[model samples]
Target chain A: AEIYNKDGNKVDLYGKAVGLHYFSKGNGENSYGGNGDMTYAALGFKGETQINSDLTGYGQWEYNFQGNNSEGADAQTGNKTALAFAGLKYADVGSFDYGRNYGVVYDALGYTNMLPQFGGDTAYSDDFFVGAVGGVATYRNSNFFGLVDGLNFAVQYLGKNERDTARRSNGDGVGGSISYEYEGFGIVGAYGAADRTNLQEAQPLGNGKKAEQWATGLKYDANNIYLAANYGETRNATPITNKFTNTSGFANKTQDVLLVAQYQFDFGLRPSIAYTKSKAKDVEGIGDVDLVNYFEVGATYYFNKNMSTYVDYIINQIDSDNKLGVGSDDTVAVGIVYQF
Target chain B: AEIYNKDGNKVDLYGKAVGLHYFSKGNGENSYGGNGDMTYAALGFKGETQINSDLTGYGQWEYNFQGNNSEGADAQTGNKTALAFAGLKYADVGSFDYGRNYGVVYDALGYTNMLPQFGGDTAYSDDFFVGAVGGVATYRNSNFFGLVDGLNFAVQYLGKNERDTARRSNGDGVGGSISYEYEGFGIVGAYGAADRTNLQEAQPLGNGKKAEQWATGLKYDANNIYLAANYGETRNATPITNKFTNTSGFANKTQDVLLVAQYQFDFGLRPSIAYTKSKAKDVEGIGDVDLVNYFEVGATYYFNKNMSTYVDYIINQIDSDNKLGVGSDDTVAVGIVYQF
Candidate 1:
């Protein structure tokens, strides 16, 4: 079941979970701030159960709210989104998902090999991580694979959910991604591309073209040292001409690459460094779009078992056409963390 | 600093904690219910250091905020209620506090053994038990004569932050409560009352006058059995009921009592019972409020070493003009508690 006690036990024939996050930025309100004011809050709950042994299944549900504003034709009412996805799987076989779920591109992008984070947020991905650790549960399982060890796969159905966009995406289409780990090395890949069947429809599949993306990752690590890298590319949307050429239309190919490493020493010191570059190509005049290259380095000095000091600096260089700020924004944060 | 790591040990100097609760009753959009509201959200921090081999010096600072509402008008704005208290002690002098704390009425009424919870509130003394288990704090020192094992003393200077009406009751007064404890029994006595005084003006003594009350408690427990009892009295606010009625105004004295007893057998079945009563003077239409009573009985069944089930039924009632539900209202609740 989806519900569990802190001791890691199945609770309630069918499990239920609750979680929330309150996010705020820019003074008291943001353009997407709740109630158009101080903050935004999200409340979500999900339930799942297992019917039998070899066949396990699950469904996801979530809700987001604009806490501060909901009146005066806000259009997007209190609970803007409520979605559910359920699917079943046969031991060695892969899972067949239904309802609203991950699109191909959405699944493959955010995962990181070295870290336990998936920065590849599909357009629909929420940065808040769901604490689901595994899918081997009798009725509930971890998010990983079955006993197949390093086997991970996900496939969506081709249905009306697709925008009928000749491209194989989920709008009326099907999509999903997967990742597997073999030993200390692992990789992940996925993409969902749908060709808009017509122009009149709002989310139509593009001009009869199957727009898609795919990526993979590689990582190797021992107890003291680690290294990992991954890259993915997505087909472009379209381009707005700057001076003379319309080179962006249907030719934009986006790319993202990340490299991170960490080392722990017996002398109570641990150091880490990471770099990421994401670019949208086939454009005009110096980077007009948002192409960013970010880098960060951090070190921790353990003052003792329950206390320590750490400092980290991150800088993001966004390519632009002399558009703004003092070089890419940078933040240097220093702090200490201790556990008793 | 007073903080603990997940393991309960004095935690890191810089640690954070936050808790929140929310409720919703009405239906959807057109629903009359207030979409959402936060009852309270708190964030706290702490730290500690070893001042010596057998002694450790520690301090704590805390702040409480009404999460849902922003800085209201008046002296209280962006900032919520805050506190700063520090103390040091050897094994005997116990610990001495030098900040805000509870009162004797608060402590005595709680021990009254009534309905276990004095109405289930730690802050609402009038609703359950009136007073703060707080004060400057008592200290133990092998003072002049070694007649007494240890002794402590304290005083309070809280001003009612409320409007002029009940301001003095909250923080506008200055007084203290003293307590002495022996091997198995403990006794606390308090006396002092202050009227609201406006320091801002020349003749600052506010309109409201203060009253005084005192109480005492005794507790005894050994091995698997525990028992507690306490009583208190408060001076009435109304010095004059009116010219027509024979109502004893300020001279009227009301008494209250509390009793609680519990026994736990080695086999894992612990049963507990408690009874509490509150008394008020007789008024015209209100009848004799001489006493409001609450009774509770509960048992904890241990399933194993780490798990247990609990069931409790509580009945609380007040003799008021419009007697409504049973002892106020009765509720039977069952739950399981496990500690790992």
Candidate 2:
């Protein structure tokens, strides 16, 4: 059977409708506390089946929401979602997929993130992993790990999608990945490159800019207990002055660490705990910055197969310079999850 | 029993390691068309305790994410997330949950939405249903056919976050929600209000913002099949004159619509679809216009209990001039949901 998207949905279709609670009660303070609007954007989707054997297809579109009508910037990002990606997949040889796809390094970095929390993983603030995700996938192999027991290899090629800079950033790039899994062990390695607007290059002529990245990761599971670790870095071109520019200086370099240990038992309950951190290095004014740190412990209880409940505690910490990237000093969140 | 913080030793947490692919060649006209960064973010936690005789206290938290350092400007709505209400829900009391919770409209809207290929329920370019979340709820004595059984009520309070100009807005106000279930019959109603900001109102005044909203919804369910409709109106204090210094009117009125229908099956699946439209009125715009029109259809598949795979199809018609506050021309998505 062919694998679907990263969410691990085999049915070839899926969606998620997420909503959040917000409070701006500390209205009077632009400081630590404030009555500013809190927003959460949810995504929903569907994937259809095959037109042929090697010709698979998929489409996705999304809209941004703030849980309600609030004072938040309403822009394209909040409005139109697009065909994330969908294309063909070869049986054994590397398949070529289409639509917006991530470069290779995603798997290695994502494995180390604790998302949507105060001290979460994978952002510039907490970005120890720097790479690119655009619209191409090629050079894939089903059996990458005859080297091990189960291993796969893949790579993608595309341009960069930076912020506020527009699609024409002329960010040409490439990426590659490798994954493996045996009885109790799993590992992944990934890397990519991009070119930003190099002062030496011109728009009318071509485009100026250059960036690159590389990463790797590993994980092991004994019984229901598990452990994982990963790290990645990004290098970019910088303008030394208005007149001179070079790719010599460090624009951004990031590293991530994850210590996870989980004990999962079949008895209706499974418990797991993890600590994750990412550090960003060498920006313009900022010398060196530790992005974010997240320490989380949580558990699950299954009432049945389709019914379950969960709870977790998360403590998020950021260095002096880069807050949650949201200007908060520090934060700790404790909450639950239930599904029917 | 209450829950612990900063601990993951007791729950199930899942993250996505997306593999995006694209193929417009993105070389000439579409540079960014071929990249797929990991755009989805999620974390869910749930736990429960049997307080006493048949009584249980439950809590849950779900968070969404952006800031995936991989794809720059095409960011994940980084400033997007929520503060799930931390409250004890009494199931015996018809499931009364209090403190900053998602509005009941989320339920009806989700159902009508069939499956989400996008993020928000933006049916129109005009954001009639904008910034309309933030509600409070409580439980009441059991009531049935004679006003005591199968009946419940909830109230929502919309707090103003912030507002910018005629282009952007905020809100402030209180609303109420009510639901009743008798046998296979169910009905839902909700009302919300928000205060939009004017040029002067948004000019930082010690912290408090000036804006408001009022909206309502109605829905009915028969067993696994449901139908719903909602109408919300928001007015901004934006001074059109602010752009021209008082030569024209100040502010505009935006009204949104959400209509939906759906059916749930015993086979761990539910499908429904909806159409949303918004219209903006008043002010000194060149012409009275409709902003955007949105359409979505989606379904969810339960995977055991806390996990599900979802899929949806979505389309949006843009009327940028009317400013209904939705996304561009079109979009679509496929995703998964693994709650706790």
Candidate 3:
């Protein structure tokens, strides 16, 4: 939606609605049950106002309902919020922004995140265990090289804040991503690292432990058939305390791989499936090794460009041969999704 | 808002930002405190395109940020979502949609839903202590027989899903409504019933315990003044699985009535007041019954259609002459809503 100001400017409004129900059963006793998952449900506001002929002002606010929280209130994380920063777009140098936004490493995932029920597990890889936190007091630039067709890049750097309350707090980070597309194929890559000075413990993509991640992915979209592949790795240095705890050695290394394929048929029908496998070796302690697999199959039918439905099935299998558990735990779930 | 595409299609985006601070006092000791409620905050997406010369394809997604989730991470219900279904629309036939949508019984209370923070409590009548969980696989139709210009009708039925996991699940239900409007006065009536066959134990609203609801309402909108009134009743068969439930009954039987009057004036200021009273019998345990009354006064000011604020005060009085607890609950809240 667009609103006219009678003063030669316009504001556009946009959002999406998505909900689903899942019948899921886990390997454990009484783990079999049904529930609704609104994870894909979200709301956001973004708009740009043309200030003159060469510059524009833009801003956005986004909130995702985490409705499944049963933690007895005062919970704010699941209500995920982003009071994005306001920025200016200059005609000559490109677009520069200050404030919170997506970190560069996570952006590398790109189009691979299109699946309805599979892949896209940032938990194992995204530079920050918690998303969007690394963008605080950050300076970022997009379309840095837009002058070259099919080639674009962005870089960001965030200053350190003295909030040691959260495990990932007080870390200063820097990152960037570069993506190039040619015809129906595209390639994207990203790298990011943060300083851990004066911090105590190492957190997933957090401050206390000096951490770094590199991710890259490839995608091809042609004739309604889409294919994508992605792999990433992360490394964390021992805490400054430097005792070299037993678990720290094995937990410092992590890697993951994801693959997805989908075909779009006529009349707004699209069927897709994806698989993601990850392995962690002695991550938590001695002999603490595990492997996990996520498999998903789904089909989406669109009534039009603005509406669609997804019928999906997902299975999560965990194999813990040595550490956290005794055997393989598997979960099966059937889900129905609606997005407007 | 309309997004113009070079390819002859359009997309629209919109959302609402509403936040509230509530000062609430419960009957329990030291049960007094403050918190925020974003119940009315929502984001939605909707669009349509011509399917053929005579048909249209449309869809929508809506998510309400119920950031008030207190449950820890496993919580999933309150993060409201509406990944709407794909539907068809034709000039000859009004509109037809599949997937999850509002229930016929709850929709019957239409006009009474105007109050921002009072009344419209369907916990007593809606299935499973919540509203809008109908229309799943359920064949639903609007303007079933458009024989009259101002006369309209709709009906819905939800199939059975074998899962007694939720308070409102495991039941098959059917419902319908008839509405007519002449000049400024309008009337509507609705009836809905569900088969509790095969549902074991009265889980709030389930169990082979048989359940049904009927509602009627009237309203007039004209000359800036809106007057409305509604009354509803619910019945439950066997209240086995004994235990008193806040919203559970016999433990079952309920009746409620609501009246509201509001006048909209110039300068975007509007004042309204409402009263609601309800009763529940055979609740919690043997021969337990209670009556409750709610009185609310509030006013709204719109800086514009996209921005507004609300000041509301509500008093909830309970009469537990029989087997329940006593005392009243009161809440004061200030809310601001922003939409785009």
lDDT top scorer: 3
Instruction: Put down candidate 2 lDDT per residue, B1-340, tens digits, no spaces.
Output: 1122222112223343222222223232222112344345555444444434444444444444543454566554533334233233444554544333554334333433344344334321112223223333333334532356666665554444344433334354555555667666555555444454454343421112433344455667777877777665545522232222324332455566777777788888888687777665654433344543667666767766656766655555544333323234444344555444
Query: Which tens-of-lDDT digit does each residue in B103-186 have in candidate 1?
Result: 434655455333311232222322111443223343324421235653445554544443343322333455555566766666
The stretch of ten residues in a row with the least summed lDDT in candidate 1 chain A is A127-136
Give a tens-digit lDDT track for model 2, residues A45-144: 5454565665455554433343333223443223334236655554454456655444466667656543333322443311112323345555566764
DockQ of each: 0.01, 0.08, 0.14
Q: Indicate the residue-level lDDT of A138 in model 3.
A: 37
**What local lDDT score does residue B98 receive in model 1, on the 0 to 100 scale?**
58
Stretch of 10 with least lDDT, candidate 3 chain A: A238-247
Tens digit of per-residue lDDT, candidate 3, span A101-137: 6666656765667776445665422234224654544
Chain A, model 3: TM: 0.78
DockQ ranking, best first: 3, 2, 1
lDDT (tens digit, per residue) of candidate 3 on B110-218: 7777876555765332252125452343333444445666677777765443333333443566777788887878888887777654443535543235567777889
**TM-score of candidate 1 on Cα atoms, chains taken together:** 0.42
Top candidate on DockQ is 3
